[PDB]
């Protein structure tokens, strides 16, 4: 009753840093996390061994933080503590979902917010890296 993502990510401030977030989560919600997935703007916070990764989507359902069973994040290379922007590059759906994962950071689904200035600083950061993330 398990399934496992994967999403291949490159840094928005810098396309030569890449990363990998493993995701699994019971089968019945794939659907949803997929959905959120595929409408989101990816946003991570490191601060040495803790990581936060935050799907910040505008799909209708905005999933509860517990459809995640575990999730990994890696880096290459290993990063500096801060915040970061992400493109998602690949999504893949993997078999043998009940493989080996090491649970490293902790996911955070929330709805994009409709204030207005919220709204145009993602319209200006849009600009300023060549990718739209309020399509
Ligand atoms: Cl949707
Ligand atoms: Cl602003």
Sequence with gaps: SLSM???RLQNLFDNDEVALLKITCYTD????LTNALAKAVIHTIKLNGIVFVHVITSSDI????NIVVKSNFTTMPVLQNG????EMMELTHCSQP???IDDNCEIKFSKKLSDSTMTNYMNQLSELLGFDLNP
């Design 98 to 100: 009940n493989g080996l």
């Design 83 to 86: 915040g970061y922007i992400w």
């Design 29 to 32: 919600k794939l659907i949803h």
């Design 5 to 7: 993502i994967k999403v």
């Design 62 to 65: 905005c999933p509860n933080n």
